[PDB]
Structures are given as C-alpha cells and as structure tokens.
Amino acid sequence: MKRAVITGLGIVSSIGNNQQEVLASLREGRSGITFSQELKDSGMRSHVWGNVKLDTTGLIDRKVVRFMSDASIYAFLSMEQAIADAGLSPEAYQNNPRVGLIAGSGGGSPRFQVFGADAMRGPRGLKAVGPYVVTKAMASGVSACLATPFKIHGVNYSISSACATSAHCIGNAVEQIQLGKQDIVFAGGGEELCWEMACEFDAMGALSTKYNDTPEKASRTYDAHRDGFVIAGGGGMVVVEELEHALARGAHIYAEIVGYGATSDGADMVAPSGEGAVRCMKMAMHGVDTPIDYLNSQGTSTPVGDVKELAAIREVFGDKSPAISATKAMTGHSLGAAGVQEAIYSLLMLEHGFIAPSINIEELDEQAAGLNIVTETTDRELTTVMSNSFGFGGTNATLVMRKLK
Amino acid sequence: MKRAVITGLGIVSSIGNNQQEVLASLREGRSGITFSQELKDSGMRSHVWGNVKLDTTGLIDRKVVRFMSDASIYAFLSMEQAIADAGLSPEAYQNNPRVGLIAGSGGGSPRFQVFGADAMRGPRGLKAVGPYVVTKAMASGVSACLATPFKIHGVNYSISSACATSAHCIGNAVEQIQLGKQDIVFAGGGEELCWEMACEFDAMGALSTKYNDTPEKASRTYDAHRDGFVIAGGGGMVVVEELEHALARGAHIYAEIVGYGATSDGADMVAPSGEGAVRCMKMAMHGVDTPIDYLNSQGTSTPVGDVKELAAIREVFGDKSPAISATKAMTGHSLGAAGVQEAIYSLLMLEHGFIAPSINIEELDEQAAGLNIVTETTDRELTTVMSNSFGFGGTNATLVMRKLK
Ligand SMILES: *C(=O)CCCCCCCCCCC
C-alpha cells in the first residue's frame, strides 16, 4: 500500500520555539523546567513546570486567535513552522480536498471551561462569558482552530487519548495516506499549561513535589529518587505525506513512518499494564527488519511508570536492547502534545545523527540494570528510531521512523 | 477491502433509555425536552434541555464508576446494551487484540473540570479535589473509562470533532475494519448535560430562549420561528464488525456501512459553509448503486444552520430528493453524542421500515421548497439511509447505511 513520510515539522516547547532551538537544547541536555509561582499560589505541592518561553501576543491574526485557547495557539504556531519547513505554498495545500488535518489535545482547555463557569456565576452572567468560550474549551479546539484558518478541505478532527493523543494523531494520518484518502495530513497537537489542569494531577500524587528548590532536577526519569512527572505545555506538528507526492514536488524527507502501533491495556485506569505496551511495540515493528537504533521512551519520571515501560522494552527486544533516553527529563510532560514533540525530537536525532542524553540520573534504578540508557550526548548514525506514548485509560501508541536512501 | 456492518446497538437519550423506548418515541414523535430549573437558576436565557430520564445510581460498579463523568456513564450503559444486543460474551470480545473501541465526547466534562477548580480554591485544596478528576475531565474520558473495564485490547482512543464527534468515531471504526486491523470495534460516544457547559452556548446566542414556557416546542427544525437549538445529553454505541466475522458467528446485521464521508470547510469557525457538506455527502455516496431513501439531516433548529444544510442537500440531490427528517426536533442536540444516536435512530428506521417525523413545524421555511420534509410518522420500506453531522471548526461527517443483500 501507500507509504507515508514526514516532510516538515514545527514545534513550540519548553526547550525551544523552533527546531533549531530544540536541536541545541537536546545536544546540550538543557532543561526546560522552571519554578512556577502560579502553581505555588494555587495551593499545589508541585511548583515546577515546563513552560513555553514566548509571548504569543500578536503572532496570530486577531480575528483568528479570538477563538483559540493556548493549546490551539501552540499547535497553530507549530503548523506555520511545519508548512514553511515542508515548503508548501498556499496554493499547494489550501482549499484542497486531499489535504487534511488531525491534531488534538489531552484536556481541551480547563482554563476557559473554568473561566466560563466563573464568569457565568458573576454579576455579568452571560455577558462576562462572551461568545468565544466554546471553541476554546471544546475537545476538538486544536483541530477546529487550525483547519478553518489554514483553509483545510480534507479530513478534520482531533484524536484524544490522554498522553498518547498526538501520537495517535500521527498514526491516524498515516492511515489516511495508506487508505489513499489524503496526500497530505498535518498531524500533531497542543496542550495549555495552567494550575486549573495541573492541580488535578497533583491531587493524584502524579507530579514531582520534592524538588521545588531545584526545578531543573525534578524530572529525573529512571533515577532511584524520582517522585512524579513535571507537567508541561506546548505544541507540535508534522507534515505526513504520501511518498510519491513528496518525491514529485522534491520535498525534503526526514523519514518514513514504517511502523505504527496502537493498543489497549484493558486493565487499570491510571497505571500501565506493560502487557499492552509490549503488543503496541510489536505491532509497530511488524515488517520492520531493520534494528531499532534509538528508542525515545515515555519515561515520565514516575516510580511505577518508568519500571513498567522498561520491563515492556526488555520483553520486546530482550538481547536486542536499543539505546534509550527519556527526553522528558529535560522537557517535562506535555501530555497531549508529548507524542508529536517526542516524535520531532526523535526525527531531529535521526536527521542530525545523535542521541540526546537521559539527564538527572544520579543513581540508576536497580530495575534498569541491563539496559543501554544513554546519559550523555552521543554522536551516531541512526537509521531506525522508535518513540512510545502511553496514557490513562490504558491507551498505547508507538511510532517507528526510518531514514530513506 | 473488508466490509463493515453494524451488529449491535445501545442508546441512552432524552427520548428513551434503550432502543425499545427510543423506537416508541420516534414512532409517536414524542419530545424528550423538558424545563430545566438548573439552567434557569444558573442565569441562562435558555431554560430547556433534552435530559436523560434515568436514575443511573448503582448501575455501574463502585470501583468503576468512581473514575467516570456523566458522558462516560451514558456511553458505558449504551455499550452494555450494545454488547448484549450484539450477542457477544466476554470470552469473545474481552482480552482480544482484534477488538477495539473508539468513542468520544464533545467536551469531556466541564462539570468535573469546574468542580476540581472550585474544590482546589477551597480551604481543603488537593484533598477536596480528590484523585479521580483527571479521568472524569480529560477529553478521552469516554474511551478510557470503557476500554478499561470492558477489557479491550485492540484500538483505544477518542475522536473529538464537536457535533460530529461520534460520527467520526463510527467512520474511524469502519476504517480499522477496512485496514484489516480489527474484527470488531465498539464506536460511539456520550455527552453530559450541565449548565457549566450549556451557558457557553447560550453566551453564543445558539440556544433557544423564546420557548421556555413550552419546552416541547423549543426545538423546531425548519420552522420559520426557530431560534437556536436545545442542548441535550446522552450516549450511544454501535458494534462495528467485519462482514465475514459477523456472518461466521450468525450475528444479527442491522446494516452495512457502505459510505463514510469526512471533510473540512476551511471557512468559518462556527457557521457552516455548505460547500464542505456537499463534498462530504458526495464522498459518502460515492460507489453506492442504490438511492438514498431517507436522510437524517443535522437540523439543529438554527436560523442559518438549517438553511445552509437544505441548500447543500438541494445541491447534492436536486430534484430527486430523499425523505428528510430532523430528529433533533424531538431529541434536542446531544452534541458529541449526536452522531451515534442519530446513526441509531436511522438504523431503527431502516430496521423497522418507517420514517420518524420532523415535529414542531408550524410554518415550513421558504428555503425548504423543493424538499421532501416528512412531518408525520410514515411507514416506508427503506433500503439505504444517510445521516449528516456537522460541528464547529467546519468539520463534516456523513454516514450511509444500507441493508445487507
Ligand atoms: C497522561 O496519560 C495523563 C493524563 C493526561 C490527560 C490529558 C489532560 C487532561 C486534563 C483534564 C483536566 C483534569
């Protein structure tokens, strides 16, 4: 069937506002985590986050941004970058039935949902709410707010699956190409960063709380003293394109998506079963006879989570254990946007020939003994890479990307 | 490619707590709209809604329902009905890599998102929020809360696209079957009903506010006196199964999905372009050698919306127009759940050989001239039916179902 390749990327993350800034952070093992007065003032125990260091004011037309929440803003800016990177002119992708968009977020916009309810209960009522809250708060905000302004005529919707969200978005885009329904599909996602959403995770005890005095050390995937993930926000977008279409226009191809896995645990609501992740990676590797040179793990820096994922990896590769690094140690967990951002970090490593380090590992967890966890930037000619994404509800996604000759 | 058929269904709506109660309401054109003190007390102008008349207390195990919001509860109950109606037992669909689930909501759970923020801002903070808000408020709540307890091992995620949400879920389920990845996929969704969410729509001026005195007459699609839609809540789920697999086990086949359209307007954020709907219907009708006997339009009962769709239908068919009926006239708009519930109403019409009436039409709009708008329960031998779903962000979905030869 049809082959799908990535021809453009765009990103807004805690470690960079474009692929060049991100590339530098990855090579340097630079943390994007900072102290958050907002989280502290909200009454939370976790006072750290991976924030987007950028004032988006005026970067989007006023009549367009008025309908958008932060998740959509981040994704929108990421898409602008991706379009430019793919060298797609307006006439090439706009008002085109064969060009679609699949992108979503993990929780839409808790900030604007709370805003609406707060305003509604005030002395102004409906007048304080305004007519823009629906498009900002709805779950499909990210796809709706991008498809409309970019004149998308093809597929248009969001896939939501907690922390696997943007990973499934990319996989679904590949499916549209494989079904011969689209030639190009912009895929990715965005996620806002706010106490309104973060406090819910803290109430679960899922966020780090013992490293507030040293923000850059809070996210420490695989470290014996890890205590939860560091919440983050941002966006990402990639251009998924049918191979022949890309070659014809002389597009720059980063890699082909040669494997896409998507499974379900059918076990616990907030804890990974591991068994589901094993099937997910095996599904993505079906027909992939090249070895995995690098694996960007979910590695959220959680006690149970990091362990379960390492076990799954061992079951899948056994003796063929590939190099591994958890970029979340420096970026934080962007939830719905993690999938696409991590695929982008993986594509950058593949494009530039290097493996980003898994930082903050002062004492490697005992259950990670026989493994190749890269803890220092290492130059190497990579050919095939894998990136895993897991979310609550036992949802699993795995993407495998490979360079083209 | 593989063919997909519907072998079971389940539903919880404002006009019935199962397919029997629903069938009864559709035949008599009974309204599910009632006066809402909650909406009135919130300060809204719209005081009516399509509420689910059911005491869900104790219908779901304590350990399970504790992670669920109303959207998930409605979808869960609908799935139970669908499983039974499909004649499936645990040994056949549980822990089975070839059985998945794709169900979503339009806005996760504004109520629990507001609850979390309100609780957090209280004197107890995190302790008041509790550890169950994330799974209730996240966008993928509907898929996560069902795939886990039902022990689903295949695909698992939600597709959100505003009022087209559950329609894209069904279509995506069909694609999974066509790709040979799944033998069965439970598809549908759910939506809670609360002022927290409703007020956002009222603030847009999209909700009916002139018929609070006569609730059952508020939703009046195609009536020259319509003034917005009536918001509703509920759930729906259908069992999408590969043809040979269904025939092999002697399942009851309602119909085959012979058409699935999904397009984008790339025009206005909240107003339909009509141009996108035209392409969506044609895409779904492509390859269908039989004419459309009935069309369950979107018909939200809005001034511009109703007119735009009629123009689109007029453009697609023209003189040879199929029977048209807007069931939202009696059910209200269940948003994210609208797609699957309407697909079900259509399957019930196809299964029982009849057309549900478009009630509350005191004065047909001038825009509906050359169109066959059925306003009275009519017995007809339908063979092929079509259902349209449109949502903000210019997202379109069309499903065409037909009796199996
Ligand atoms: C990742 O799997 C952990 C869950 C992330 C879900 C997306 C964020 C939803 C927040 C909704 C408000 C609490």
Ligand SMILES: *C(=O)CCCCCCCCCCC
């Ligand atoms: C249909 O397209 C109208 C918009 C429906 C959006 C989904 C329902 C939830 C909206 C956001 C609530 C916070």
Ligand SMILES: [N+]
């Ligand atoms: N990853």
Ligand SMILES: [N+]
């Ligand atoms: N419909």
